[PDB]
Amino acid sequence: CGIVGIAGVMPVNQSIYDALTVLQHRGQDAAGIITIDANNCFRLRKANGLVSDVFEARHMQRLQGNMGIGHVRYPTSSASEAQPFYVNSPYGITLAHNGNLTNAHELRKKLFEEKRRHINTTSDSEILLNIFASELDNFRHYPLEADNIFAAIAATNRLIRGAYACVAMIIGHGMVAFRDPNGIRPLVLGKRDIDENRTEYMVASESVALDTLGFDFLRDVAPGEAIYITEEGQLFTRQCADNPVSNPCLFEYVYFARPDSFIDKISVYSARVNMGTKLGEKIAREWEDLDIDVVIPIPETSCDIALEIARILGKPYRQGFVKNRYVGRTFSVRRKLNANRAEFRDKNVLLVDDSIVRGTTSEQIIEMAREAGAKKVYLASAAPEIRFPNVYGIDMPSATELIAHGREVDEIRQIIGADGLIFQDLNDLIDAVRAENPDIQQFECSVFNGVYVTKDVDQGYLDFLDT
Amino acid sequence: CGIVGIAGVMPVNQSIYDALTVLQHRGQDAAGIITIDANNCFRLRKANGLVSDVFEARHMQRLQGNMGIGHVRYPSASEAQPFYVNSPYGITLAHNGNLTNAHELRKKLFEEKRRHINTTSDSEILLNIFASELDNFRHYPLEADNIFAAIAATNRLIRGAYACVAMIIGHGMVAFRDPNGIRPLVLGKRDIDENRTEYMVASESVALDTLGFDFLRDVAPGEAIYITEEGQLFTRQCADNPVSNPCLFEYVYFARPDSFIDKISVYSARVNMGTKLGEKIAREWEDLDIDVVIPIPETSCDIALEIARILGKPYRQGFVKNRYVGRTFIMSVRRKLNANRAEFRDKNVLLVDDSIVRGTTSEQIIEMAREAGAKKVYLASAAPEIRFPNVYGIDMPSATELIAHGREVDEIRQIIGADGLIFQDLNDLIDAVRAENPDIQQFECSVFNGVYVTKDVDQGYLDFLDT
Amino acid sequence: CGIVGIAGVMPVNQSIYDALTVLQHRGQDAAGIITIDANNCFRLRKANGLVSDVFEARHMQRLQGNMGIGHVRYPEAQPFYVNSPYGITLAHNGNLTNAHELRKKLFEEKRRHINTTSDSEILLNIFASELDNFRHYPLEADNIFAAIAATNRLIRGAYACVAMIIGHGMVAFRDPNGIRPLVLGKRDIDENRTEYMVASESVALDTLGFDFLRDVAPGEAIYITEEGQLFTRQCADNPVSNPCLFEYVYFARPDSFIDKISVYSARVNMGTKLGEKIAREWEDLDIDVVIPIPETSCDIALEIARILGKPYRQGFVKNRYVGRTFIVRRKLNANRAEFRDKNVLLVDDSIVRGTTSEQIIEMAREAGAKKVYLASAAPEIRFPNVYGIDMPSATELIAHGREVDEIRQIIGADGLIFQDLNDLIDAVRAENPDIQQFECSVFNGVYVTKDVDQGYLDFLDTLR
Amino acid sequence: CGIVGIAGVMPVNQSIYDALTVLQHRGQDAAGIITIDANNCFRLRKANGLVSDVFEARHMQRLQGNMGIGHVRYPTSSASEAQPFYVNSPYGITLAHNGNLTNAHELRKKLFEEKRRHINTTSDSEILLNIFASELDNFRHYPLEADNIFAAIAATNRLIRGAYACVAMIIGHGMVAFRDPNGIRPLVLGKRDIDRTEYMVASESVALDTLGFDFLRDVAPGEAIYITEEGQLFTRQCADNPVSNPCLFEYVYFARPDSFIDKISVYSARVNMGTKLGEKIAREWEDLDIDVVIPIPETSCDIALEIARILGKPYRQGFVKNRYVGRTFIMKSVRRKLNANRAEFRDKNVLLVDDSIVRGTTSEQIIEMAREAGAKKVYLASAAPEIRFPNVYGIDMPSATELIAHGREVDEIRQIIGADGLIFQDLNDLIDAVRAENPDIQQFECSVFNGVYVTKDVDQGYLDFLDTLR
Ligand SMILES: CN[C@@H]1CN2[C@@H](Cc3ccc(OC)cc3)[C@@H](O)[C@H]3C[C@@]2(CC[C@@H]3OP(=O)(O)O)C1
Ligand SMILES: CN[C@@H]1CN2[C@@H](Cc3ccc(OC)cc3)[C@@H](O)[C@H]3C[C@@]2(CC[C@@H]3OP(=O)(O)O)C1
Ligand SMILES: CN[C@@H]1CN2[C@@H](Cc3ccc(OC)cc3)[C@@H](O)[C@H]3C[C@@]2(CC[C@@H]3OP(=O)(O)O)C1
Ligand SMILES: CN[C@@H]1CN2[C@@H](Cc3ccc(OC)cc3)[C@@H](O)[C@H]3C[C@@]2(CC[C@@H]3OP(=O)(O)O)C1
């Protein structure tokens, strides 16, 4: 998913709309925008579909105010309620959330038993809003001070487990934003000076959101850190986690994040290029005695990666596939992709793709290369084998739907009908990313090695999540 | 506005939809339905427009549950009912009427409970006052006595008129009525089979008939109803000094004729209105010559028929109301009514309308009769002069827009351009209605005499309302 | 179905919209409007649904022009149009009984394709085909009337039409039997500018402030040029006035004047006739109250109560709002105080399938009524209508093949009585005795158009 | 715009939907499909918006038949102003068109004055449909023979002027398709053998690929195609002096890279464009020092890669295209479609490569985006030559009064867009770049560059215009 919040001095409805559009790649199932008008009342608009579908003219006019947050959903269901969520007591709080709680079932029971707070959905973003809400509910003075809010967030970080990048608003106070104690989910802080007296603030899941609005990049929101921006335009920061550490989602760099984004001081584009350098060198070694004629990227994530791989192997780079800018319904990847036949005929081709989950896409893309007249079809995956399920925001097939589960490269290869299959090495992937910011010692790579940094996941929770 | 709530053992989504459709006359501006599904979670759908527009197939599929409440609003671009709060327990409420101390109540909710009110609707205020009272208990689940206690404390807090219906998660449906019994609310039951019994409440009895529910009785003034999730019915008075002062205007116009409010058939009442207006015309207009009595559809159709009987004159359909009415694009009573030319030609006509508020409609209708070739046009209002604003759930123009305000009958006659004008006496009206149930000794007729039963209506508020 | 055409000096999009609303009772299935702008082009908007739902603000801005026509269809929509010759659009209320023959001729003789099943597109093309035979420009009034006269010789059945021709003006005509209603109205702005309009009922004329001129005579045609000139002419051989009798019974508006016959006054007379018959044939009948079934039979049952000397009371209340059902009680509600322990006389305007009556009678007993009797304002309906009236098949008609008692027994009534055909006729004829013979095929099975009987004769030849 | 026509033995609604989608790049303003059902009747669905928006499930179920045509239109009112159009007489004819008629006015008059046929829209597609119809109206037999139809198209070609690639259907006959005498607008023919042979035609070969049709050839300039309801194929030359003058801008920008237009791979052509441009920069920009070559997504991506290869400089993605753009609500910057990767500009002499310059608006903003990103000197290379003239052969572009390269020389344009350096592709180099993939193409349609219009009526009307000045 993708979130965004703006504490401005002027109407921010169009701004959030534009910000979400550059973040539309993080979720396309639903979208939402909530603002605070001149009467300290929430204006909400949220539904299913793309941002351009959800927000029509009449909706934007209703979304008055200089402060507001937005959210775009990556499914998990789809027919369920979308974010941001809202509660009237205390004060009136709204919250958008990117990530996943691992003890949501435990928290839902506490909120009812200990607070008589009802949770109407299966979204753990509503659970998060209420956990944060019940803690704010313990104060009885007004207005709240920054320390009360930071105390509430600190108390929330003790109760909840998992990964979360959050942004929220409180009526008559301002905007808050915080990151989990592991820095798994991305979150950046921005700034924009209108004049010497007025400065706007915004947070977003990616820096591209900051860029497209003309917001000056400040920095990443630190792990376990919380931001608070009063409606007077004042910035308060505070460490609200006990033992914070930078374990950024590695797969953000591999695929999900935008290439022109900078996450934890790491250029997504550069790191992604470095992935090609690693994978290219590995291919030069492991496939030394194989004859390859051309490197053909599977658009669009693997384009710059495949280019570097070609640079290493000294082979030519060629646009063998074309992705259609638009796609239609069927009231079958050959509707997204089309093979430039002249680039496959009587050639040994190396296809480069970002990853392999189920193996369905890969099998078909290989068929297309052969139907185009390719002698041999070799495939390379920019990311290592994906054998374990993510529980930090990335939703994926059950561990059994994964083709790499209980299988090895040669078996996975034979199923997808490739002459050769080669995965990126997890350590090479780490080095490729670490090269841009060595301060980062360990990433979050559960989908690869099955090691969860939160330390609270068993087969029991995994079995549960399936149902 | 119109309200409905059904506590049954079957999908009530369709039954509430049908219930609101027979109540659609009570409000066309907005509609809402909320239910409690098998997982004890609220399913909500509410928007602007008519019931037929608001609820499409996909919405009905969502509204699962064996218990729910409905609402149809009479005004406008604001948020509609029913409203919902997730804490405590999870409550929802639909309300018909008005709170005269809503501003006071909104302050208390904020300063004392930190509960934010996001809407100008006092139905959200009434929802939060109630929720805040249920908040004082610390056990679970609640007993019938606790719910009744909270409703009692509510009545001691809120002023004005109100008929409500609500749902508390894991408890059941509750419904109550203001101490003065101003706003309509009836209780009904249906025996599906010997083992289980369904219950429902609604604004008028026609909703009970439509669904096939047996009419039990009117909800007593200040009384509260509580149907558990197990179908157990609880009843208890929650006001200190209950009185039956039903809205007189429900009888004059707003309620359907086949409805029985407080043991009074609206139809039988409106006949008696014609009986006493005809008798009044017989004496005070004895010398005048009229050739025919013509009703202005459709409330006065049976009233004018009675007036015709008493006068011994012919009753003829002179006006026809267009069953379909369209828009007037920005790119007037004639688009709703049409004169049967033959019925007016060379005749002294007596027009019978249900009321006179602004006086605009009356003027145009008289002019239509003139264009239709009428020598003289006399207008008889089935209701007394309207001089004072209603603060109990009836939307009307400011006291200044009322033509009968600060004027006398003949002054009104000249402006609307009639040769003769006569109103029914307020005491004739009361007798006409009381003759169906002599038990009721007093009515809510502040729009006629300016006597406010709650007594808590002072100047300033009356002048504040014009905002 | 209902049609309207306006030839004015000012924008008519709103006017046609308002006219269609008061005619909305003639069709709720679909609606369409087409106008001609200053560039002499057709602006069209048509789709399924009510008039209020079909035309939104964005459509009305497209419907520019001082002339145009509208249509509401009783369950592709109208109007249709063709580009050659000149550009012709047409809306039609009625039905063609030789549509298959006409469709065959248009293809073999003129190479004109028909893409829909609507005989409005057929009628439009027959008319357009005739206009194609002229090569001079502009066409004159005589040319157009000849084209309409030629059409009347080819087509068969009942029809009230309104049409427009690019760069010429509006035309409207009526079938040789005057079965489907069509009226003409005017409206003076100044002495040199006069607007004209035509419609299915006079209520459309009244609602717009147009002066009623006269019924369009059977077989007659109307023509209004762009310059606002009126031409009339008889375009049929041996025209006759055989207006639809059922228009007066139900379909038409009570405040409409069809062929100089007030629909309202007509429906009163029917009650007078039906009330007098009950006094004679049901002299032993013991009823406590006369109850109408909303909304057509209200002023009929009122008259029936007068003739019987019994009281009249609103026993049923129809819901003003339609309610969809997902995957009669919905529209009618019984005032259970007017039935309780009473012998009631229910008055409905007609019985077709017998479904509505049966359930309504059950609703009467449910309300505690002792005996439920049923009077029908219209005679037994035993035959199909092929003249532009949507009714279920003859196989679904309950009165067909069954007698009065058997009918009464299927709907479960203690008493069933029908209006007599001749009594009904006199009721309507009393308003305008110049009308000798009505079109009432649904009742007696007599079809006035001569084309229909020969069709039977050729049907018999196939049975050999 | 884009067109497609399928003549098969199975339902073609989905097939045309899939075809229009891969041609969606040729026009996004409106779309329309029309088929002939079992009853030999026309089923039509057309309205404004993308293909995916115009065609919902309820519209797809009504589009029954085994033969039909589709259309996508670029931005021009009503839904009846979209294609295809349709006339009920004679026979029943529908037609979809990609191009532009240079004598639409005189054709509107002849149709009215001579045939009494009314034109209701501003689309000359409706004009083209009525011209072809009135010619078919001269015959008095049935059914028409393939020879009769071809004769009608021939007479049509002698009447109309301009550029066009059409596909049409005639009730009870089959699918017709033809191309203008100059072969300006593209059109390709394909087949599919299910056991019976299906046939389709489309603007680009990619439509054939995505549906699994085998590629046969380009429809020849002035040639016509006729496919009957029974699946018989006819071809005929209906132009008197047919010549191949393919639209040069198809290869530059508008055509899909994986399409083969007139035996020329669009992708190979653009690579060659990068070659010719890179070589020109190495010649005329000896001294100037750059640190990186940055393409402006997405057309110039592979072109910039080649230019960088030639220049021996690095290729880096300085700009990223927003794949989702939204509405800007009243109550238009290029930042909505483009974002800068700040790290790739900072303290560098960048060479930007855009496919073209029309108004100079986009270029100016993109140059500033580079400047604020940290770039020292920003150079701009255009894959296409100066655009100095309006296109009247079916290409949609701003009014000729907005063309920055008109009456202005390169250095004037450079300081208006605020570039440190500006360079255009030479038309001769560009022509050699495309003609290298198919030397038998001698002359292109590049009127937007040289102001040379291959159709004589244009140059003739120009002199008639000059006469009005006196
Ligand atoms: C060109 N880029 C595409 C996007 N790719 C991935 C992206 C992805 C999303 C979530 C995730 O979390 C675990 C991991 C990866 C998948 O959507 C698809 C397709 C594709 C590659 C492998 C998969 O196809 P599959 O192998 O399951 O059939 C190609
Ligand atoms: C045919 N029935 C209509 C309903 N009537 C009333 C109904 C009404 C609403 C609120 C109320 O509380 C004060 C009292 C009455 C008004 O809607 C209209 C029209 C009408 C009568 C007098 C008024 O017209 P106005 O005098 O303001 O121009 C006719
Ligand atoms: C009071 N409003 C309705 C008037 N009625 C008629 C009107 C009608 C329609 C078509 C027609 O063509 C021959 C003749 C008459 C029918 O719509 C329905 C319902 C109704 C009564 C008898 C019929 O129901 P049915 O007998 O088929 O069950 C009630
Ligand atoms: C990166 N892809 C776009 C392709 N471009 C062209 C495409 C084009 C359209 C019509 C035409 O008439 C023959 C020639 C070319 C123009 O749309 C725009 C924008 C752009 C580049 C130069 C122009 O910008 P302008 O200077 O007009 O503002 C960027």
What token pair was written down for B139?
Answer: 């056990």
**Helix, strand, or coil here: D366?**
helix
Measured between its terminal Cα atoms, the distance across chain C in Å is 39
C291 neighbors C310 (Cβ within 8 angstroms): no
How far is Cα B382 from Cα B405, in angstroms, rounded to an integer?
A: 18
Q: How many CA atoms lie within 13 A of A439 on its CB side?
A: 8
Residues of A involved in catalysis = 1
Binary contact (C25, B323; C-beta < 8 A): yes
Which is nearest to D72 in space by CA: D36, D11, D19? D19
Distance from CA of C122 to the nearest CA of B (A): 31
Residue numbers after which chain C is interrupted (C to N above 2.5 A) read 75, 327
- DSSP letters, B178-235, are -TT--S--EEEEE-SSSS--EEEEESSTHHHHHHT-EEEEEPPTTEEEEEETT--EEE
Between the alpha carbon of residue C348 and those of residues C248, C290, C356, C440, C460, the distances in Å are 15, 11, 10, 19, 38
Q: Are D92 and C114 in contact (CB under 8 A)?
A: no
CATH of span A273-324+332-439? 3.40.50.2020
Task: Give the distance (Å) from ligand 4 centre to CA of residue D248.
Answer: 15
Which residue is it, tokens 């073209």?
D356
CA D363 – CA D383 distance, rounded (Å) = 13
How far is the C-alpha of A398 from the C-alpha of B329, rounded, in Å? 56
Q: Taking the CB of residue C73, how many other CB atoms lie within 10 A of it?
A: 24
Give the DSSP letter of residue A256.
I
C and A in touch (3+ CB pairs within 8 angstroms): no
| Structure tokens that stand for B30 in this block | 């907005």
Contact (Cβ atoms closer than 8 angstroms) between residue C70 and residue D74: no
Integer angstrom CA distances of residue B297 from A19, B352, B375, C25, C295:
55, 9, 22, 17, 12
Cα separation values, C414 from B46, C333, C369, C405, C419, Å: 47, 21, 11, 10, 17
What's the helix, strand, coil split of chain C in %, to 5? 30, 25, 45
CATH architecture of the domain B267-322+332-464 equals: 3-Layer(aba) Sandwich (3.40)
Instruction: Collapse the DSSP code of D221 into the 3-class scheme (helix H, G, I; strand E, B; otherwise coil) and give the result.
Output: coil
d(CA C302, CA B263) in angstroms, rounded, equals 28
Contact criterion met (CB below 8 Å) for C102 and C109: no
Residue B354 marked as a ligand binder = yes
- Cβ A157 under 6 angstroms from ligand 1: no
- Pairwise CA distance, residues A240 & A247, whole Å: 17
Return the closest-CA partner of residue D106 out of D151, D168, D67, D160: D160
HSE of B229 in the Cβ direction (CA atoms, 13 Å)? 16
Residue among D331, D279, D287 nearest D310 (CA): D279
Residue B223: C-alpha distances to residues B124, B125, B175, C195 (Å): 21, 20, 8, 64
What are the C-alpha distances in Å from C173 to residues B4, B353, C97, C237?
53, 41, 18, 14
The gap from C-alpha D241 to its chain's centroid, in whole angstroms, comes to: 23
Give me the count of residues in chain B: 467
Question: Sign (positive/negative) of CA torsion D283, D289, D292, D293?
Answer: negative
Residue A301 Cβ < 6 Å to ligand 1: yes
d(CA A401, CA A410): 18
State the best of A46, A64, A89 to mutate against chain B, taking most chain B CBs within 10 Å: A89
Three-class secondary structure of residue C75 per DSSP = coil
The bound ligand whose nearest atom lies closest to the alpha carbon of C348 is: 3
Q: What is the DSSP string of D89-112?
A: SSS-EEEEEEEEETTHHHHHHHHH
Question: Helix (H, G, I), strand (E, B), or coil: what is residue B48?
Answer: strand
Residue pair A268/A257 in contact by the 8 Å Cβ criterion: yes
* CB half-sphere exposure, D333, CA atoms < 13 A: 12
Is C62 within 8 Å of C46 (Cβ atoms)?
no
| DSSP-assigned letter for residue D79 | G
Task: Render C84-98 in DSSP notation, one character per residue.
Answer: SSS-EEEEEEEEETT
Tell me which residue has tokens 């066309």.
Answer: B28
Phi and psi for B82 in degrees, rounded to 5? -80, 160
B-chain residues within 8 Å CB-CB of A137? 114
CA atoms of C255 and B343, how far apart (whole Å) = 10
d(CA C202, CA C184): 8
| d(CA B14, ligand 3 centre) in Å | 26
- Chain A residues whose C-beta is within 8 A of a chain B C-beta are 41-42, 62, 79, 87-92, 115-121, 130, 137, 140, 142, 171
The answer to whether the Cα torsion of A356, A357, A361, A362 is positive or negative is positive
CA of D72 to the centre of ligand 2 (A): 53
- Tokens representing residue D273 in the block: 């464009």
Q: How was this structure determined?
A: X-ray
Report helix, strand or coil for C455.
Answer: helix
Which H or E run includes A236? strand A235-239
CA distance B403 to B405: 5
Residue C343 CB neighbour total at 10 angstroms: 17
CA C145 to chain centre: 25
A301 is known to lie in a ligand binding site: yes
Asked whether D82 and D31 are in contact (CB, 8 A), the reply is yes
Q: CA-to-CA distance for A390 and A100, rounded, in angstroms?
A: 10
Residues of C forming the active site: 1
- Please tell me whether the peptide bond between C138 and the residue prior to it is cis, using omega within 30 degrees of 0: yes
Q: Output DSSP code: residue C312.
A: B
Looking at domain A2-245, which CATH architecture does it have?
Answer: 4-Layer Sandwich (3.60)
Please check whether residue A364 is in contact with residue A432, taking contact to mean a CB–CB distance below 8 angstroms: no
Pick the CATH number of D272-322+332-439 from 3.40.50.300, 3.40.50.2020, 3.40.50.460, 3.40.50.1390: 3.40.50.2020
Contacting partners of chain C (3+ CB pairs under 8 A): B, D
Single out the residue of B466, B422, B428 nearest to residue B445, CA to CA: B428
User: From CA A42, how far away is CA A38, in angstroms rounded?
Assistant: 10
Q: Report the CATH number of the C2-242 domain.
A: 3.60.20.10
DSSP state of A343: G
**Partners of chain B (3+ Cβ pairs below 8 A):** A, C
Q: Topology of C270-320+328-423 in CATH?
A: Rossmann fold (3.40.50)
Hunting for tokens 């195609």 — which residue is that? D225
CA of C304 to the centre of ligand 3 (A): 20
How many CB pairs lie under 8 A apart between chains C and D? 57
Listed by start position, the domains of chain C span: 2-242, 270-320+328-423
Tokens 């929650």 — which residue? B238
**For residues D311 and D293, is the Cβ–Cβ distance under 8 A?**
yes
Which chains share 3+ C-beta pairs under 8 angstroms with D? Answer: A, C
The two tokens of residue A60 are 């934007």
Q: Identify the three-state secondary structure at position B170.
A: coil
B306 vs B310, B436, C311, C318, CA distance in Å?
A: 6, 17, 12, 21
D60 and D13 in contact (C-beta within 8 Å)?
yes
Does residue D449's CB lie within 6 angstroms of at least one atom of ligand 4?
A: no
CA distances (Å), origin B210, targets B28, B197, B261, C323: 19, 17, 16, 12
Cα B71 versus chain centre, distance: 12
Q: Using a CB-CB distance cutoff of 8 angstroms, which residues of chain A are in contact with residue D14?
A: 330-331
Backbone angles phi, psi at A343, to 5 degrees: -100, 0
CA B386 – CA B353 distance, rounded (Å): 14
Q: Which two tokens stand for residue C256?
A: 């409409």
CATH superfamily of D2-243: Aminohydrolase, N-terminal nucleophile (Ntn) domain (3.60.20.10)
Separation in Å, CA of B340 to nearest CA in chain A:
43
Q: Where are the alpha helices (DSSP H) in C321-420?
A: 355-366, 404-410
Q: Determine whether B1 is an active site residue.
A: yes
Half-sphere exposure of B143 (CA within 13 A, CB side): 5
Q: Where are the alpha helices (DSSP H) in C229-382?
A: 245-246, 263-281, 298-308, 355-366
Give yes or no for a contact between D208 and D259, defined as CB atoms under 8 angstroms apart.
no
- How far apart (Å, rounded) are the C-alpha atoms in residues B41 and A121? 8
Residue D465 token pair = 């215009």
C379: Cβ below 6 Å to ligand 3? no
* Chain A contact set for D267 (CB, 8 A): 319, 340
Interchain contact, D52 vs A327, CB within 8 Å: yes
Instruction: Please give the resolution of this entry in Å, rounded to 1 decimal.
Output: 2.8
Pairing of strands B214-218, B186-190: antiparallel
Q: Are B386 and B307 in contact (CB under 8 A)?
A: no
Tell me, what DSSP letter sits at residue D376?
S
Q: Which CA distances in Å does B58 have to B62, C327, D439? A: 7, 11, 60
Name the one residue in this structure whose structure tokens are 């530059």.
D252
Q: Are A313 and A348 in contact (CB under 8 A)?
A: no
Residue (of D450, D265, D288, D414) closest to D280 by Cα position: D288
- Say which amino acid occupies D197: T
Is B66 strand, coil or helix? Answer: coil
Residues 6+ apart with CB under 8 A from D151: D135
Tell me the C-alpha distance between C249 and C266, whole Å.
8
What is the C-alpha separation between C80 and B276, in angstroms, rounded? 57
